[PDB]
Amino acid sequence: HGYMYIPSSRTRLGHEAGIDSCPECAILEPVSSWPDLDAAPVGRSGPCGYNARDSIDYNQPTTNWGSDAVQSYSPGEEIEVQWCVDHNGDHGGMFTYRICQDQSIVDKFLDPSYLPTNDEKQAAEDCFDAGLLPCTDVSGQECGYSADCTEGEACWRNDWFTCNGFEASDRPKCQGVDNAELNSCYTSIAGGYTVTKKVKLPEYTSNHTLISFKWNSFQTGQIYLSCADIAIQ
Numbered sequence: 001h002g003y004m005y006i007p008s009s010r011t012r013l014g015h016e017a018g019i020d021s022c023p024e025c026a027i028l029e030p031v032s033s034w035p036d037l038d039a040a041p042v043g044r045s046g047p048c049g050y051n052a053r054d055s056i057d058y059n060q061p062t063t064n065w066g067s068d069a070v071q072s073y074s075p076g077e078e079i080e081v082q083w084c085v086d087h088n089g090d091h092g093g094m095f096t097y098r099i100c101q102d103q104s105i106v107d108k109f110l111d112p113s114y115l116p117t118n119d120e121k122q123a124a125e126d127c128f129d130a131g132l133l134p135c136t137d138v139s140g141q142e143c144g145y146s147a148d149c150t151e152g153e154a155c156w157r158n159d160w161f162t163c164n165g166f167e168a169s170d171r172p173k174c175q176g177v178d179n180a181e182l183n184s185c186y187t188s189i190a191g192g193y194t195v196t197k198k199v200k201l202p203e204y205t206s207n208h209t210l211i212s213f214k215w216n217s218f219q220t221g222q223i224y225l226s227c228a229d230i231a232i233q
């Protein structure tokens, strides 16, 4: 149970505007989230998430999200990206961040009076996959392999980030990555823990595009998706 926190995703904004009582509850499930990290099609969830809890589809703006870039960055900028895992829903596994470089696709997600179809959701997803922001693009960032994976497997990759071992001696699962304190970010269920990394933005530009957060669960057949409205200028 988790969601994108920095820069503020639509889900965070959703919660913060009082619309979404369980931001961490937005789940793609059931799916094969492991070990093949993109076998699973995003269906209704899309690259921005659908929260069944409160029936929110974050793939289109409302008055409460998606109207504006929440943050403006520069081409090639290395930036903080953070997500929030719930104390009772730390599934371990692997996560990534992506920018889709086809403004025409993304535009379908920036109009409050249109909801992307599942078809457009999946096509967006493919675009986001092509625009995955690799761990290893940030100089100085250590990009480990998953302890829940073995060499040569489809999960064996360090473009994505990994949580710690689900049954590791020390600092297990996603919580273990920052080893942050409880409520270091908001979750509704049992209090949130931050999971913090850096990504390097592309030299691709836009006055208004999306980061899509995607977290593939190891413990469960589940994926958590969020997106943030951002500008590269």
Ligand SMILES: *[C@@H]1O[C@H](CO)[C@@H](O)[C@H](O)[C@H]1NC(C)=O
Pocket: 205, 206, 207, 232, 233
């Ligand atoms: C953003 O929009 C303004 C108004 O059209 C324009 O003048 C500016 O060049 C645009 N910037 C980008 C990166 O598109």
Ligand SMILES: [Cu+2]
Pocket: 001, 002, 088, 089, 090, 091
């Ligand atoms: Cu969960």
Ligand SMILES: [Zn+2]
Pocket: 037, 038, 125, 126, 129
């Ligand atoms: Zn995918």
Ligand SMILES: [Zn+2]
Pocket: 036, 037, 038, 039, 154
């Ligand atoms: Zn695959």
Ligand SMILES: [Zn+2]
Pocket: 081, 082, 083, 195, 196, 197
């Ligand atoms: Zn992160």
Ligand SMILES: [Zn+2]
Pocket: 108
């Ligand atoms: Zn259309």
Ligand SMILES: [Zn+2]
Pocket: 142
């Ligand atoms: Zn190294």
